[PDB]
Amino acid sequence: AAKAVAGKDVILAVFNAAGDKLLAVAGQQGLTVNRSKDSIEITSKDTVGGWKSKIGGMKEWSIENDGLYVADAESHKELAKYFESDSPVCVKIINQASKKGLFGGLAIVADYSFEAPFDEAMTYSVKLDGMGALVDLTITEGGDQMP
Amino acid sequence: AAKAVAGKDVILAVFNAAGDKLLAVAGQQGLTVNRSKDSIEITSKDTVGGWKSKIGGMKEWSIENDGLYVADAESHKELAKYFESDSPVCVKIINQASKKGLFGGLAIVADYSFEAPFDEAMTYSVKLDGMGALVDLTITEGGDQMP
Amino acid sequence: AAKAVAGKDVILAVFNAAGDKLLAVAGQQGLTVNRSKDSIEITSKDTVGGWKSKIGGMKEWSIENDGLYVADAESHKELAKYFESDSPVCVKIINQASKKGLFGGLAIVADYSFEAPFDEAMTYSVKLDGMGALVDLTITEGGDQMP
Amino acid sequence: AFEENLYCDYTPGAAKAVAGKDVILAVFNAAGDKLLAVAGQQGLTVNRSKDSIEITSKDTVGGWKSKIGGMKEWSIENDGLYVADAESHKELAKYFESDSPVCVKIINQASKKGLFGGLAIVADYSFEAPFDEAMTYSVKLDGMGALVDLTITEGGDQMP
Amino acid sequence: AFEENLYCDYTPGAAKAVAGKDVILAVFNAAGDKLLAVAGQQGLTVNRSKDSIEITSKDTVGGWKSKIGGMKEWSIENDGLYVADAESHKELAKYFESDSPVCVKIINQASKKGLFGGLAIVADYSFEAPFDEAMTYSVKLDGMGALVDLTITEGGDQMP
Amino acid sequence: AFEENLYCDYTPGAAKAVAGKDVILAVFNAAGDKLLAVAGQQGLTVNRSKDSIEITSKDTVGGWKSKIGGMKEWSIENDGLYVADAESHKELAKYFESDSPVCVKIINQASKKGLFGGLAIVADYSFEAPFDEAMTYSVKLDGMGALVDLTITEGGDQMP
Amino acid sequence: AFEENLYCDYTPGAAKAVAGKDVILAVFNAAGDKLLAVAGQQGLTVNRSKDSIEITSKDTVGGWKSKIGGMKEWSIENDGLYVADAESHKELAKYFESDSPVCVKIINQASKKGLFGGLAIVADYSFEAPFDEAMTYSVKLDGMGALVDLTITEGGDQMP
Amino acid sequence: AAKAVAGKDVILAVFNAAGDKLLAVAGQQGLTVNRSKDSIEITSKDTVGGWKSKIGGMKEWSIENDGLYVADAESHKELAKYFESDSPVCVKIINQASKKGLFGGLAIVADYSFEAPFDEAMTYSVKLDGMGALVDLTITEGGDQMP
Amino acid sequence: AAKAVAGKDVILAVFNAAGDKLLAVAGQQGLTVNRSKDSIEITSKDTVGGWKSKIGGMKEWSIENDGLYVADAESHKELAKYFESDSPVCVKIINQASKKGLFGGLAIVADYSFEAPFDEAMTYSVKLDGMGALVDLTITEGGDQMP
Amino acid sequence: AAKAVAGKDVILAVFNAAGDKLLAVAGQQGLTVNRSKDSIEITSKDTVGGWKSKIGGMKEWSIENDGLYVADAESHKELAKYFESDSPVCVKIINQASKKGLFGGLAIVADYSFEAPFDEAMTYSVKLDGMGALVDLTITEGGDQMP
Amino acid sequence: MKSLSFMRVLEAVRTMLQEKGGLDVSIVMRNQVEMPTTMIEMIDQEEEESQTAWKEKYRFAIHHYTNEQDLAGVEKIDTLIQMGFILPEGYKLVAVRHCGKQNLVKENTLIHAKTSFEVSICRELKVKI
Amino acid sequence: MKSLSFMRVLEAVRTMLQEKGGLDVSIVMRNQVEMPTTMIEMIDQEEEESQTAWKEKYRFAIHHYTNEQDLAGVEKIDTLIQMGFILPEGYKLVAVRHCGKQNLVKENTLIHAKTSFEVSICRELKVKI
């Protein structure tokens, strides 16, 4: 096995408007893939015991990505268009070291903000909210288009 | 006695779908077991004194586990299947040093997220919320399968 | 007087199930006793002045004790039974150096949680919510059973 | 549990409270031999009222209004989680469509004592199915006759 | 408590309040020799109402509506925690089933002074048992005549 | 208070607001020589209403409904912290039991100007005893006759 | 799923819960050959009530009113997201305008068991379009006769 | 003038039950006096301008004090009685260097809690909620009873 | 220009009761002035685009000043008088270097609190809530009274 | 490309009252542009799968700026005028290195606050709330007036 | 309360050593030495941080020179030092711990064992009255 | 108020010593000396951190040389320095603490005791106006 995967090897990729190219968003420095499932409480106290019964609820996911922002990068020239047009965007998390895809999904750019301190470089932050299923490519076959 | 238990010896394991193999989640670095009980307020002020009366309520438990994330490990290929398929997971906390089990129970994968920092390795986090009794093995006989 | 009391001499003790043995909770590393009272609002603005009026409210108390966790210890096999059985626990606070008790009372084990770092020993936390009066043993005669 | 109970007082002189998780409504089956506790019980309300009759006569000294008690009535409302295959819910429907009176008993499963028994009719058997929750049912029972309390009268302690 | 009360005024000249944990409802037993405090009391309301008869005559200067005082009635609402074996709760049920008038009194323990006494009927004796809470009761009393105000009259200060 | 009031303007031309802690209710005693301020006051409501009679005639151009003003009535609502020992509270009970019309006044105790004085009947005198609060009273007075506005009429400035 | 099920009880002996996402409302098309699930469903409420006739006679010992059940009625309230081109919505409107009774069914799409079938009238068909949300719809159906319970009767499991 | 008042000369003093002694709380290490007034809103927009208008409302005050806990001193056995007996307590703030009183008033012991860390001295915390006027002795004549 | 104004050169000044003397509060150590305006929602969905519509609402202001506390200075003998009598206070901001006023207005003393650490000097904190317009003296001619 | 943009090269500029001069805010030290979109939940549970469905809402934007404060600055003498008159203000973001505009739009000065330490220079903070659309100039042709 | 000078600590520890172990140990430090002996080297004294009590840390050293490997003797010196000593009234030892250099060398024609100790002394607690 | 140079501190401590102890103490520091004496060495001076007042820490040393082990003299100097001294107008002596090296060595033909002191002096409060 590998016993580890370096964090400089996992990248976020975006399908352009036509969908013919997979863009590695420039300036990447951090990723966060949050996957949550709700819990519904089934406490009916005709049940012996003394513990609170629960079941699984509904599932959701989101992505956070921050890094350096170069505006002329054509990858950033697609994120702006998606943000302005309210069109869903295809997002894929890619391991460039193992050449394997990890998670594909249809997401919406919910937050696109960036900061310009005078003593550093201009950094950008992006939040993508999941519009439905986040397909785990680690279990499912296929999904290995790098670019 | 021992007067202490080293933290590198308390390890989390889950059961596979058939339940025939106990798999230790590869890459764990931390573990937190929360067990909480509610408290009702029953102050009937026909009573002498001046303090507030309370009885115990319902009990519920949860587990936090985070560490390094390796995708090809079979154990992480089982947590993902459970998180996708909404099936309960049988989880067990064992002391690999004294070869004693501690706590077993059914849980739902409420949160399965992970981080990909630029200068670090990819780290994963898991939240398990149990549906009912968390049977502790430190006061009862049984529950001693290590693998 | 003593002008102070060293903190490594204030300990928490729990009465066993039959009440015959006062067990010092093994692994104690910290202790916090909170005693609070509410405040009723009686501002009636037919009264000259300009300052807000209050009276004494309702009193309650709680204790949080944390430290290192040893599972085989007798005191840790009693707290587990009390937590699982929803039974009141008799707790006492001892100045084991001056051989004088401070506060005793009935409590419910509201929380029993513990966390296991990778590079450190396994630690536990306990919260006891007061069921009724916290009797002060410093202004009351008696209450000095040491063990 | 010692030191002459100087600070810890367990001495039972009352309960001081009755946890709502110990109070369960149960019904008798059609044959009347099986007492089934309604599954999914989560709420209970037992309403008992008596009418008031006015006897205000304009020749009474004082300055207040005169009243007496009228007729009494009672009803039960119980709601909770609903499963279709439970015997209790497979018996309530049988009473509902057949319009037959059902024997109902409210039981404290902790003290092992009964509280109130009576004969009632399902005047409302409704249930809700919110999409982000478990489907919930509610039952209204209106009684025909006396609601015999089991706290003043001896007997009525059959648990099941 | 000193410095000539320059900043700390400990002089008792009034109460300025009566904390609600001091007003209790007391019920006379069947024999009338024991005053029982209803166990588990947590809320109390006393309603006193008067009707208004209008005498508006279309030949009065002014331009305002004329009314007089009508008849007076009163009622009591109580709610609290219900324990079935308490002596007080075993007496209200007896009065409820027997339709007998019951003597009630309002007692301030701190001032040891009676407030209001009268005869009432339990027009409602209902209670709920929420699953995640403690099972609580509510009592409604309607009064058949004078609610004697013990704050202006002499006597009526029995504590129990 | 200077720099030619360049930013700080204390010039008195109005109040622009009247803090509710400055308006109180006063009640005349039975003999009528003492104005008692109801102790523990915390809320005050004054209702003044006039009906509307409709005279819609089906031969009027337009399309709107024609009316005139009806009869006028008024009432006061008060509530606050209740002590049973205060003299003002010892007068409200006496008026309530005696059906005696009571003289009431609304006083701006800050501006030392009366607002509304009139004769009313105590329609409701109720109070509560919450267990985690202070026992509080509520009073309703139904207007009998004109509500003499003291803001347009001269006089009526007895402050006690 | 092992160690002799010491702490993990995977034995299915009941359901103990039925999530509302598994209960849907389906209607029969005009031809009666296709069962269409109402698209955009987000809520469902089934009400089943029975009337109660009083037979209290003033020569009966006791003190409780005598009651007997009357007629039975059922109704359904559904609501959720509305899309105009959905086939089920293009069937509901046709029934609404034509006054034709619609055959309706309640389906547990998880257990593949039918629950309740009947004939109903679309009494209300309303929808809202809040500016900051999606356009939602609400439907009320009143039953013309018996609502056949399918949890007590064999059959009625057409799934679509 | 003074230009400053060193903090180790401002102390909290409590009147005993009889009121004949002003006992200085032993173990004092911190002192905070909070005095606040509400702000009412009368913004009616028939007023020219463009700034939201307010008046001052109702006044309240409180005192927090923390330090080392000594169990046997006279002062700490009286705060226990005041807390238990639900009685108002007379508190004063003394500048023990300039020998002038600062603030005296009736207060309610709302919180009387304390901590016993293992590697430190066992410390205590006290909160007093103001019941009525807090007299500013720096503007009023009198109030200099020292002890 | 000046390219900056040192923070030790702007001070808070309070008008005395008659308004004859502008007293600079002694012991000034920190100062912050907040000036905020509310935003209303004119978001009506008949407008093309996709952006949320807003307008400007009501304006208010506040001042927080803290520093070393001396109780004998006439400035602090006035703040207490204003605080107890609930009278509006006249406050000004003076750039004692350029000899120009900055901001004047009427305020209400919402808080007057102070702390006495045992190893520091007794520090005071003051919050003034805006009462009406805050006249910007940097944009309006006049307002230069120095004291 | 550039691979980055230095943070000292991105500035915020404001249009004067008549709009004939673009003035850079004197004293600029930091800048943050926030662009967010709402998320609508459309979970109608007649849909197979198990992931919560969402769509896009409305878009808002805002700017945070802070830096050193100079009172005589005409740009600072214009932000005060805009804040006082409740008039919409035209703001632009300039990359003074590539001489390319980034973002221009109408905003309302929601907050204009500034704070002055004792040991530092007096600093100012500005919050601008979006009054409608924020047109990105990196995707649209034009918007390059430099001053 | 006034802080102890290092010299008082040296006298107290020397008296404790001589009285409990029967050792002739001198305080005066000498650089070039001959014949076996035992000497105490005072390193420094500073003020440690603990926001309840005035506590000071005294670092000193014990030089034990022997012509042959003296093993149990330095054991005994270490054990006695760690058990604590008597200080004048008003001062309490809080902890005795090793710090600095612990060394064992061979110089000239004799072995030199250096054992450095750091002791904590509380003079009075940090509290206003 | 301008920062006080170490020279004034040296003059003040010399005057305090000579007045309250009759000690003839020299300020000039030497390297190779002879016969018993007492000498003061200024080590350094820096600014402590406190956002309440302008405060400076002066570290100096006291060298006491004597042919005999003189406990009383060093203890007396300790007491006198820790007691405090008078400063020129406008300065406040806040704290006198031990810091740095505390040593008791023997050189040539006499014992040398070195006692280092750190004194805190406040000149003005850090408040605008």
The full 3-state SS of chain A, as one line of letters, equals: CCCCCECCCEEEEEECCCCCCEEECCCEEEEEEEEEEEEEECCCCCCCCCECCEEEEEEEEEEEEEEECCCCCCCHHHHHHHHHHCCCEEEEEEECCCCEEEEEEEEEEEEEEEECCCCCECEEEEEEEEEEEEEECCCCCCCCCCC
Min CA distance, F39 vs chain E (Å)?
A: 8
Q: Provide the residue count of chain B.
A: 147
Single out the residue of K58, K57, K119 nearest to residue K84, CA to CA: K119
SS3 state of residue B72 = coil
Q: Which residue of L has its CA nearest to I94?
A: L129
Q: Is E8 within 8 Å of H137 when comparing Cβ atoms?
A: no
- The CA distance from F107 to F24, in Å, is 5
Kindly report the number of other CB atoms within 10 A of residue L127's CB atom.
20
Which residues, in sequence order, are bridge partners of residue D140?
A: D77, D124
Which partners does chain I have (≥3 C-beta pairs < 8 Å)? F, G, H, J, K, L
Q: Is L99 within 8 Å of K46 when comparing Cβ atoms?
A: yes
Min CA distance, C34 vs chain K (Å)?
A: 21
Q: Do residues J115 and J36 lie in contact, with contact meaning Cβ atoms separated by under 8 Å?
A: no
Please state, in angstroms and as integers, the Cα–Cα distance from residue B127 to each residue in A32, A34, B83, C27, following that order: 16, 12, 11, 27
Cβ-in-10-Å burial (0-12, 13-18, 19+) of F149 comes to: middle
**Total beta-carbon pairs less than 8 A apart between chain A and chain J:** 112
Residues of I with CB under 8 A from a CB of H: 26-27, 58-61, 68-73, 76-77, 80-81, 83-84, 86, 108-122, 129-134
Q: Which residue of L has its CA nearest to K11?
A: L71
What amino acid occupies position C104? Answer: G
Min CA distance, D14 vs chain G (Å)?
A: 32
- The CA distance from I124 to B85, in Å, is 60
- The CA distance from F151 to G66, in Å, is 62
Kindly report the number of other CB atoms within 10 A of residue B32's CB atom.
15
Q: Do residues K56 and K123 lie in contact, with contact meaning Cβ atoms separated by under 8 Å?
A: yes
Q: Which two tokens stand for residue D128?
A: 């809700």
Q: Is I108 within 8 Å of H29 when comparing Cβ atoms?
A: no
Contacts of H28 in chain K (CB under 8 A): 127-129
Contacts of A40 in chain D (CB under 8 A): 132-134
Q: What is the largest CA-CA distance in chain I?
A: 65
Q: Which residue of I has its CA nearest to L94?
A: I119
Which residues, in sequence order, are bridge partners of residue L95?
A: L120
- The CA distance from G124 to G140, in Å, is 5
Tell me, yes or no, whether chains A and D touch by having 3 or more C-beta pairs under 8 A: yes
- The CA distance from L80 to L82, in Å, is 6
Residues of L with CB under 8 A from a CB of I: 50-53, 125-129
Q: Which residue of G has its CA nearest to I52?
A: G132
Q: Do residues D144 and D138 lie in contact, with contact meaning Cβ atoms separated by under 8 Å?
A: no
Q: Is C145 within 8 Å of D7 when comparing Cβ atoms?
A: no
User: Mutate which of A37, A42, A48, A54 to test chain G, going by most G C-beta atoms within 10 A?
Assistant: A42
Residues of I with CB under 8 A from a CB of F: 15-20, 88, 90, 92, 104-106, 132-135, 137, 142-143, 145
Rg (CA), chain A: 19
What amino acid occupies position G28? Answer: F
- The CA distance from C80 to J24, in Å, is 67
Q: Do residues A33 and A135 lie in contact, with contact meaning Cβ atoms separated by under 8 Å?
A: no
Min CA distance, J57 vs chain D (Å)?
A: 22
Contacts of K127 in chain C (CB under 8 A): 3
Residue J114 dihedral angles phi and psi, to the nearest 5°: -155, 145
DSSP label of K29: B
- The CA distance from E87 to E38, in Å, is 9
Q: Do residues J78 and J20 lie in contact, with contact meaning Cβ atoms separated by under 8 Å?
A: no
Single out the residue of H63, H61, H75 nearest to residue H147, CA to CA: H75
Kindly report the number of other CB atoms within 10 A of residue D80's CB atom.
21
Resolution of the coordinates, Å: 3.4
Nearest to C143 among D3, D9, D10 (CB): D3
**Total beta-carbon pairs less than 8 A apart between chain A and chain G:** 9
Single out the residue of L129, I27, L3, I15 nearest to residue H2, CA to CA: I27
Q: Which residue of I has its CA nearest to G133?
A: I45
Q: Which residue of G has its CA nearest to I46?
A: G131
Q: Which residue of E has its CA nearest to H146?
A: E3
**Total beta-carbon pairs less than 8 A apart between chain J and chain L:** 6
Min CA distance, H109 vs chain I (Å)?
A: 19
* Cα dihedral J48, J51, J55, J60 in deg (nearest 10): 170
Tell me, yes or no, whether chains E and F touch by having 3 or more C-beta pairs under 8 A: yes
Helices and strands: H and E segment counts in chain J:
1, 8
Contacts of D53 in chain E (CB under 8 A): none
User: Mutate which of E8, E11, E21, E22 to test chain H, going by most H C-beta atoms within 10 A?
Assistant: E8
Contacts of I135 in chain F (CB under 8 A): 6-7
Report CA J71 to chain centroid distance, whole Å: 21
Which partners does chain A have (≥3 C-beta pairs < 8 Å)? B, D, E, G, J
Tell me, yes or no, whether chains J and G touch by having 3 or more C-beta pairs under 8 A: yes
* Cα dihedral J113, J117, J121, J125 in deg (nearest 10): -20
Please state, in angstroms and as integers, the Cα–Cα distance from residue C125 to each residue in B103, B132, C8, L106, following that order: 17, 21, 18, 56
Min CA distance, H133 vs chain F (Å)?
A: 17
Q: How many CA atoms lie within 13 A of G6 on its CB side?
A: 19
Q: Is J108 within 8 Å of I139 when comparing Cβ atoms?
A: no
Token look-up 């058997």 returns D125
Contacts of A38 in chain D (CB under 8 A): 132
Tell me, yes or no, whether chains B and K touch by having 3 or more C-beta pairs under 8 A: no
Please state, in angstroms and as integers, the Cα–Cα distance from residue K74 to each residue in D131, H61, K20, K63, following that order: 80, 64, 14, 10
Q: Which helix (H) or strand (E) holds B36?
A: strand B28-41
- The CA distance from E117 to E154, in Å, is 12
User: Mutate which of E18, E42, E106 to test chain B, going by most B C-beta atoms within 10 A?
Assistant: E42
User: What beta strand segments (E) does D29-81 contain?
Assistant: 35-37, 41-54, 67-81
Q: Do residues F127 and F68 lie in contact, with contact meaning Cβ atoms separated by under 8 Å?
A: no
Nearest to B20 among G2, G6, G8 (CB): G2
Helices and strands: H and E segment counts in chain C:
1, 8
Q: Is E17 within 8 Å of C47 when comparing Cβ atoms?
A: no
Q: Is A1 within 8 Å of B70 when comparing Cβ atoms?
A: yes
Q: Sign of dihedral through CA atoms E142, E145, E150, E156?
A: negative
Nearest to D81 among A38, A44, A57 (CB): A44
Q: Do residues F93 and E152 lie in contact, with contact meaning Cβ atoms separated by under 8 Å?
A: yes
Q: Do residues L107 and K29 lie in contact, with contact meaning Cβ atoms separated by under 8 Å?
A: no
Tell me, yes or no, whether chains L and K touch by having 3 or more C-beta pairs under 8 A: yes
User: Mutate which of A37, A41, A44 to test chain D, going by most D C-beta atoms within 10 A?
Assistant: A44
Which partners does chain J have (≥3 C-beta pairs < 8 Å)? A, D, G, I, L
Min CA distance, B45 vs chain F (Å)?
A: 7
Residues of K with CB under 8 A from a CB of C: 52-53, 125, 127
- The CA distance from A17 to A74, in Å, is 12
